[PDB]
Amino acid sequence: ISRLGGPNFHEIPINRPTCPYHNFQRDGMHRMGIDTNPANYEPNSINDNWPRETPPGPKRGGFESYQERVEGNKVRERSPSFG
Amino acid sequence: SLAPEDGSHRPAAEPTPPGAQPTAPGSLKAPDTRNEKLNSLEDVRKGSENYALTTNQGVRIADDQNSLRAGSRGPTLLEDFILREKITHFDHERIPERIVHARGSAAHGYFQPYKSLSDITKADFLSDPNKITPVFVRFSTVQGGAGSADTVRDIRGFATKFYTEEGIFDLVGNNTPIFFIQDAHKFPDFVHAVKPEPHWAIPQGQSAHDTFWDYVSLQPETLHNVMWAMSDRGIPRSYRTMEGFGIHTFRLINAEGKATFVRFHWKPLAGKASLVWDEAQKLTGRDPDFHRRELWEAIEAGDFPEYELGFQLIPEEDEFKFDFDLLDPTKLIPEELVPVQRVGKMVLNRNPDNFFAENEQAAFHPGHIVPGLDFTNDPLLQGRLFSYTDTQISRLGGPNFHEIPINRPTCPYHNFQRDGMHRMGIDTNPANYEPNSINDNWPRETPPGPKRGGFESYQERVEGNKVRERSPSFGEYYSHPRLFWLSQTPFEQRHIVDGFSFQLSKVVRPYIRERVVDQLAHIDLTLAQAVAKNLGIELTDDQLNITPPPDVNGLKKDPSLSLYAIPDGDVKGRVVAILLNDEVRSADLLAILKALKAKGVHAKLLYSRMGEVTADDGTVLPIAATFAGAPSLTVDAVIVPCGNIADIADNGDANYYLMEAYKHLKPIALAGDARKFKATIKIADQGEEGIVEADSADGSFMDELLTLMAAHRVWSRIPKIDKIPA
Amino acid sequence: SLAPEDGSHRPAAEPTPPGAQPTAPGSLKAPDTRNEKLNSLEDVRKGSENYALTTNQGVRIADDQNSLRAGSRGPTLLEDFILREKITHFDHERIPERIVHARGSAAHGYFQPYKSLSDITKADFLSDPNKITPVFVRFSTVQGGAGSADTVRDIRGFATKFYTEEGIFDLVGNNTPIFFIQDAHKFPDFVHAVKPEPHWAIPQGQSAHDTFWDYVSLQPETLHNVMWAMSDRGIPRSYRTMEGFGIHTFRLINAEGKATFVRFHWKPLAGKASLVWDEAQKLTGRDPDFHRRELWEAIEAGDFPEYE
Amino acid sequence: SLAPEDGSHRPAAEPTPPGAQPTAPGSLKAPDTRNEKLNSLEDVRKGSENYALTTNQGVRIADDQNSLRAGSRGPTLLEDFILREKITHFDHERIPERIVHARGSAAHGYFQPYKSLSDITKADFLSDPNKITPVFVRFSTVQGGAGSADTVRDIRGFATKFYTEEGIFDLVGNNTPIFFIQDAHKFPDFVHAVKPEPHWAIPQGQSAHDTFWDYVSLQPETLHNVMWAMSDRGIPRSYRTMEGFGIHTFRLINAEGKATFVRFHWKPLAGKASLVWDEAQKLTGRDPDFHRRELWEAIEAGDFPEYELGFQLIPEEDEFKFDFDLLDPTKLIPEELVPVQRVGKMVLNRNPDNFFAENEQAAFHPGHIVPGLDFTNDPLLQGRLFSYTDTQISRLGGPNFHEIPINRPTCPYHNFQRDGMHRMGIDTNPANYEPNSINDNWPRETPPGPKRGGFESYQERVEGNKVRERSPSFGEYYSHPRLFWLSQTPFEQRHIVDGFSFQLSKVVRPYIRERVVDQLAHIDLTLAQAVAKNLGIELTDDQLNITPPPDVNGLKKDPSLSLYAIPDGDVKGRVVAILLNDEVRSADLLAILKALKAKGVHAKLLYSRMGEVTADDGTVLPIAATFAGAPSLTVDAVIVPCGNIADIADNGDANYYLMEAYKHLKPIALAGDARKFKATIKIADQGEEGIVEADSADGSFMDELLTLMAAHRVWSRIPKIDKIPA
């Protein structure tokens, strides 16, 4: 945000994805992309809810975190195994 | 010298009623009002009288009227550094407005507890009734820009910065006890839906548009807060006359380490009061700064905004005792179930000096807590903790925003953080890391403890898998909207119905209106049918048969949810229009002003022109404003004294004054020949409840008027106003 | 599918009168309208239909309704990069508004001269009646913020960007033929005087306050433009029904090097029309976006703003 | 407590020589060294000892070693506001470096004039010899980034901010009396040509690359400052031993309104001295912070950098009496024609506390002048006036950069400018415009006058058409380069030829080399022939016949252009390496050390390891550094005392220490059996000038060594060094 001047740093040519990117984020300094979507929010009916979430799957699916088990209390403490 | 000889350019440094003097920077108007934070700002306050005009580098300017040019009709030269510095500074005056709550009005004050809370929290600011904590408070709307109007229908923000001896605590709340959404991941979606639509940037300061109601219809978790926004809660009369809430369940932590769940409340000591919709909308055109102005002038008059801080406290063992989740910020805790304990009082007693430096630059953030408080896993709160540090890096220019004077703590602050843009502090520590030997590890960590200890999080147990999933316990959307509905008076229900009908009539896509009516039918059939009738929609048989949602823990209403069900009227600080004529009966005017003064009610003397008029005994009466310049929208009640009533009886502006005031349910009082105005508002000869009338202003006349003003508005008049063309 | 079965969510892509259809982005509403600048913007226009929702790095999102937490009632985790990108972008949406003329409304169009002006100017965009130059025009008020109301009493801006074959020419004018002050050195003084006063930031969108009339009373050079502002010129009915002026004397320079002094005008082909004060003031309350709306809806109906 | 119990972590707060103690923030090293700017910074200086570690919001931290996680091996929680604040501030520490002069070292000090200059200027800081003006001075290179090396070949900046009672005056100069170019419109062309090339960003801190010499070969106006850069002026021994110049002609204006043209000079009271190239280039590797380190340590030792301000003064009527234009910044004013008049003395006597806050954020700008000074039409100065205000808007984050503490004036500043990012001052003035009546027009304009008056520009006549055209009076490129060349000693000429030869050797396109050699042939044929021989280029018959440019107003040399032609050596503050052995003759070392201390010369005791050695008589010698750790590059002279010379005589590092010092022309003294080292450097039995040798370090050995040090280097050794493999 400070180094590259704002939240549109992915639009700086070197950083741009070569695959498609579409979402409901808008504006910010030096915004390049001109969005034509009538909707800037989801869920929406006014654009039939596009762009849409994608379920996870074997290829081309949405991102889902691995459901690791978390068990412990809220601590600021170094694991004894690290000592 | 350009000031007038008589010194009438400078306002008196004493409290004065609204309109009596020009308004002024707070340290000029009230120089002897002090608190630890206002005194700490003295290092950066700059005066002006008797100083020379200079560049920012301290060079005295001889001619501030002209650019430097080659010849007096020639081109401007690049060596004019005086012109370029002055135009460069102007060119860079603006900073980004806040992404939400951009329109807001702020004041300084102080808070003091009523008793030590050490049994329930170790927070130092709550440890002793003689502990006085300076505060700075910013009230705001949500959707509109910094230049949008004040009296829009909207939720209002209510943000308090407490400058404590153990750190800054910011309580960043709104004027309703829930929010629209459950999880912070949806906040950009919701905010984009309510904000002006992206193709054309319309509408400003309004939720009455397709995308807002599209999102509401598709996200029934919104309906509870939508109900509050559609009620008269969405159009408060003053920031002095609305409630505040922290919304989220937080924790208090005591010196033994015990955690108690808490929700925060601010109760207005001037009582709860709202406008009516027609009046609020019209006021956005006649005075889009009405709330900003009213707050500033209340403080200059000594009508200080006062609020009691209150805590709803729930033991840790009672986390699951209710039929809603305590961590769900779309659910309220009914006061019938968990009472509000009154904990202390905040008084706002001084305006800023400079709005940009102190209000626009102020940074509030709910993750600014102190030892003795802690967070919960409310998933809207959890995401807020990220946003308010992040947004200030662009808004305020970098990571040193705590060095901007209004944001500075008044207690000590020392650490190993260095640099960043516009770094003010010049660190002398040889070390900028720890652990260090070279400064004997100073500044040093401090263990947690009962007082002056380091912050340690409550050691809550966390058990579960890493999931993006809404708790099933949050999946109930209708029972709170219905409890709120059932708790409103009949006229407050009519205003709700009217709010939904007005908003949905502005939605162009009719299916969205229909989908909202279907949601309302899941709350209350009467509501749904009344809104549907105004939209020309007929409920289906299925909609007529939807089972109402369950009561909340056995409640079918809670009157603390209504603005008006329980009387809390306070007249002090309110304002009356007195409509003058060119020969007022001075004895009416004496009696009126005396009775108002006794109750701390202000007046404004109005006429068809500016200047002065002369009463029957020769008293010279100065005119504050014209009938059109200061419409009835801006006052709480209207009084017409006797005199040469012919002077004004045919004035369309004075007649309209009283029609507008009548339509908006305001008390109206008419003395002697002023009773000829009964005809403009269609009052029967025998009179009507809410119109005070008598041969003279009489004194019993004034008690009756001030009784009506303590009840705020004349609700029983509502069926009579549909006739009035106004 | 959340859209209705009957297609009524989607505005007809053809000219329609105000209120007949929901309004839409211009390239959706009027896909057949083009000019050289609109064509050159194609490389940056982003669509939406039939695309997956992604991060800005192009990773497909599976659940855009929830943060990542340890258990469905537990704390949000710092590793949720989807949540933090989406909220970081939101957090930094705003940029500073314009110091003056922060409220304004804009549209694309095109300009063409009636004949070659080569005897008086070598400016390329005026050289040939067949040469069409794209424009982008913004109209504005002066004093209020970007979220202030349209039908205030104020001067109006009228700024045209001409995308010529020999460079951008911006004609940055107002709707009256003079300004308030003589020397640019005084602009921060005049603008501070008209702007909301610095202790309390009131009033918005209004010159009806002590500091403006203090300045005027001490600087009689301001009285000409003040007359204009106090007339119904200060409250136009539409951006379509107001005059435009460059105000300053500029120069045209022909190919032989001869200079002619020029002042620029725009004539509204819809004619000149203003509100009356009580209407204009009440309209700031009933529809603070009235001029922005009227401009957009005129263009959607085919009532194109035309100026000479 | 992690500090050693003996307190050896903390440097003594008293002057100490380089290396004796760790270096510290200036206010801790020299707390009693004060001036009005240093005292004015006290409101922002932050201590650390005895204070608790906190957030920037003043909350005490208990555990600054760990993030908050769900279990001690679990994930980090978003609610960790202490982690996020600390990492957010870290993440935004950097600000843009300066576009040019990014690499620089600064210090605080004071200036006093020798007598009132009221007859020639009304500037207040020159009006009274007892008026002391605080200064802050930054010295710099030009091309490299803020992390580039100090002893590169380049021009140096010499910038002085004077905090006067009538405004900040910045005198923003370099260490050569002209610049490379004539009109500011070419400054981005020239700087882009000298800077690292745009495809790969190489080379850093070097002009030895194709684009710089392409531009030079095409722009012969650059050749004069190119001559100075290729001489040993381009590689100063220290910031204390270089000249400063304002370059441009400015004006002085006295109280009667008479203008006198002026060029500004600084004379170094430590004398002029430069490195030799091979030493400078090696030093950029062994100690890229050598000038920063040397400045800081001189100040800590009390070897304060001192400079005398002087003026070349030309009456208005003599504007056109020279062969060159006074407004042309590629031309110098020879001191034989217009002598420098001594004006006053500047002493730098305190280091900053924090480099970022004071050095990195300092803003100097040559448009910051005061009444009694004014500009001329020099077309390089004229463009500079635009640039320095503009560049601070991005570098320092907006238009409030004069509020960052180091940049604040010490005199009053008041005006109508408001807001902007990072606004610190809270204005209380009811008015933010003038003229105003509501504050009686304060702060007010001030007419010009003899003292404490408003700024007014000198009413110079302008007459001409609007043109983009270079004055024909500027179109002469070669006579000043030639005057410079002929003014240098024979060894300085050799060093110039080697500078051009080395640089053009790195230009990869040979045609660029050839074109530069052709330009040299227009300056002086001996120069062009010598550089051509080193490049393997043969001059054509046409080149051999170019007629030399004219003399400059009759001069064929001016010795004041040489670093060394006129002796001005000063040994105080210089440093000598003493090569120890394991049993040093202690009487030698007593004599050596006390002779050095008597003349303020520092010593560094070196050996093959750290720790101690014990002398013949039991004296314990603490070791400063090893041979390889503190190479001969970092010292002015080398002394080897007698003792057990066999300890070190076959040590490769010890031998090479002497070879390197010998190649770089440094004085070397050898006592007793240390004379066995004569074979390493090939010195004859009957010895040679520049090598001091005796049976012992007594009698005249130290006087002879110190004589050699006052002459800086042994130039007569140059023909002896080419054979030597070092």
Ligand code: HDD
């Ligand atoms: C037209 C542009 C321009 C030109 C022609 C010059 N400069 Fe410059 N100079 C800059 C534009 C600039 C700058 C972009 O404004 C800098 C970089 C960062 C800053 O604050 O100023 C700067 C920095 C800078 C600094 C470092 C100040 C400091 O320590 O922060 C020095 C000493 C000079 N310059 C000296 C000179 C001299 C003696 C010049 C010719 C006589 C000269 N500059 C020409």
Ligand code: HEM
């Ligand atoms: C849950 C109900 C919420 C309430 C009552 C609330 C209240 C507020 C208030 C009162 C302010 C104004 C502070 C001021 O006067 O200066 C504010 C500003 C802000 N809020 Fe919150 N908010 C809520 C939810 C959120 C969420 C979930 C996010 C982020 C996902 C958020 C992000 C912001 C941002 C970015 C600002 C501007 C802050 C600044 O620029 O300093 N709000 N909100």
Ligand code: HEM
């Ligand atoms: C001569 C009378 C003037 C007229 C008619 C005029 C007209 C305008 C207009 C129409 C805009 C808005 C452009 C848009 O729609 O984006 C504007 C912006 C601006 N004007 Fe001028 N102006 C005048 C005088 C000045 C003067 C004298 C200055 C300063 C010396 C000035 C400084 C600015 C600034 C700082 C902005 C905002 C520009 C931006 O942020 O892009 N105005 N003015």
